[PDB]
């Protein structure tokens, strides 16, 4: 038991007429200025017991963010059987707030907590009694077979992990350990998935550039587990993610502008992130 480290305490000082004054320095080198108030003005002794808990990366990334919203429909119409089945790519790029926080680092390692929240309504103009619904969330690692339908054989989940949730119970949850094939997940990939060679045209590699073409973490397949009812039910499933046990490397500036897709592509109509000021001398 001890007090956690605090930010710097200011030591009392006095006026200085020396030949060694920190206020004048150079930033041609890559260093930042190092001056603190005690170098510029007379200061009092201040005891500093304040700390930086909220800015620890573990705390910064300590919230479960919404990642995506998926939709299923329970329906007796043959034209809607396909709607009982929804496959989503695993990604964090569907929602912008989480993405910007992650985009601060070039590389990261973390375990991931996933939580799902279900909500449902009748999309119809008329409703009536329907049995409580059960939903199945199955993870299909890349290379595993995909179901062709909501009721196909792959849903038997012999190897693929899956979770069964009864609507109304506590939102379902599970922990995913770090799964990269690299020693860290990359948030950026300045390269191509394959090298196009001499015996290829000169437009070769156009669709192989970026993190987008290199990463594949499989998909999440979600289905209704009930058979169809006379009264249609629309189900919206929110998927949440919380990185935990997280380490990061090589900081980057955050994006100032709106994203176009999963890459770093810019929107021609939205490249003007700053507000105008009437003059340089306006406070």
């Amino acid at each position: 038991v001890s007090q956690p480290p605090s930010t710097q305490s200011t030591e009392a000082t006095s006026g200085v007429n020396s030949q060694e004054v920190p206020a004048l320095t150079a930033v041609e080198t890559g260093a930042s200025g190092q001056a603190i108030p005690s170098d510029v003005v007379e200061t009092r002794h201040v005891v500093n017991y304040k700390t930086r808990s909220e800015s620890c990366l573990e705390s910064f990334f300590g919230r479960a963010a919404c990642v995506t919203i998926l939709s299923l429909t329970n329906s007796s119409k043959s034209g809607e059987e396909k709607k009982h089945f929804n496959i989503w790519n695993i990604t964090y790029t569907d929602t912008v707030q989480l993405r910007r926080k992650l985009e601060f680092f070039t590389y990261s390692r973390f375990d991931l907590e996933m939580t799902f929240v279900f909500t449902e309504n009748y999309p119809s103009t008329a409703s009536g009694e329907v049995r409580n619904q059960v939903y199945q969330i199955m993870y299909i690692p890349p290379g595993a077979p995909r179901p062709s339908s909501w009721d196909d054989y792959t849903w038997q989940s012999s190897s693929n992990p899956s979770i069964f949730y009864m609507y109304g119970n506590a939102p379902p949850r599970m922990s995913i350990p770090y799964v990269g094939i690299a020693n860290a997940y990359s948030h950026f990939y300045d390269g191509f998935a394959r090298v196009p060679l001499e015996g290829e045209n000169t437009d070769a590699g156009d669709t192989f550039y970026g993190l987008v073409s290199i990463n594949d973490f499989g998909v999440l397949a979600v289905r209704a587990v009930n058979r169809s009812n006379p009264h249609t039910i629309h189900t919206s499933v929110r998927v949440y993610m919380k990185p935990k046990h997280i380490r990061c490397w090589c900081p980057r500036p955050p994006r100032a502008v709106l994203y176009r897709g999963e890459g770093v592509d810019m929107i021609s109509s939205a490249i003007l992130p700053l507000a105008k000021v009437d003059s340089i001398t306006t406070f």
Partner: protein, 234 residues
């Protein structure tokens, strides 16, 4: 069965929850770590990096590279070179510096802020600039005399370059709110010529300086909040 009683809070999902949960992949073998350069442990390590201030947001320079260029000139002037409100979280020009962008994920902050300036003009030119910070609640420092009453230093141009003025942590409060409330006001930062910058013959008369902002290592932030800077289509 051990008698138990569920209390309020049962069967709810809090995005701030810190509970254990079953592994979806029991006995999974995690890829061994390697050392990677550039490890970051705390966001304040980034807050303390000097980054460039888009000081010039006049019409025609907004969202252009020139936003970071503060003009200086050989001609005589008694006017402020620039004026800035000390609101690193809500000010139009400071909110988008790295200090600002990190800070905008927080609701409150403390500690001092360093303002670093560098002259990129000719070696041949000399002069002295006044860098000054006045605490809030008084007439804005619209002239040199008021700039002298506040905290200030003189930047004497010569062999060295960069000069750092520090806006000390002066507040009534322990922390300041990020939101630009009247009771949050940080005060005023200005720069004035102390003396005319003198340009010798056959030397350009229009000069530029760059400004940078960073946290001092007494700086900290409190509650995490969604940042208002980013949006997306629904």
């Amino acid at each position: 069965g051990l008698p138990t009683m569920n209390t309020p809070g049962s069967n709810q999902f809090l995005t701030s929850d810190d509970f254990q949960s079953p592994c979806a992949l029991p006995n999974f073998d995690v890829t061994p770590p390697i050392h990677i350069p550039g490890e970051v442990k705390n966001m304040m390590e980034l807050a303390e990096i000097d980054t460039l201030i888009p000081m010039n947001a006049v019409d025609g320079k907004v969202n252009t590279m020139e936003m970071y260029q503060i003009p200086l000139n050989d001609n005589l002037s008694k006017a402020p070179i620039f004026c800035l409100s000390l609101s690193p979280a809500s000010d139009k020009r400071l909110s988008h510096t790295m200090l600002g962008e990190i800070l905008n994920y927080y609701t409150h902050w403390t500690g001092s802020i360093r303002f670093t300036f560098l002259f990129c003009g000719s070696m041949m030119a000399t002069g002295k600039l006044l860098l000054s910070y006045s605490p809030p609640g008084a007439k804005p420092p619209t002239n040199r005399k008021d700039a002298m009453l506040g905290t200030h230093i003189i930047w004497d141009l010569g062999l060295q370059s960069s000069c750092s003025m520090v806006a000390p942590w002066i507040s009534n409060t322990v922390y300041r709110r990020c939101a630009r409330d009247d009771f949050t006001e940080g005060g005023f930062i200005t720069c004035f010529y102390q003396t005319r910058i003198v340009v010798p013959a056959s030397t350009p008369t229009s000069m530029f300086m760059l400004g940078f902002v960073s946290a001092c290592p007494d700086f900290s932030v409190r509650l995490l909040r969604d940042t208002p800077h980013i949006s997306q289509s629904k």
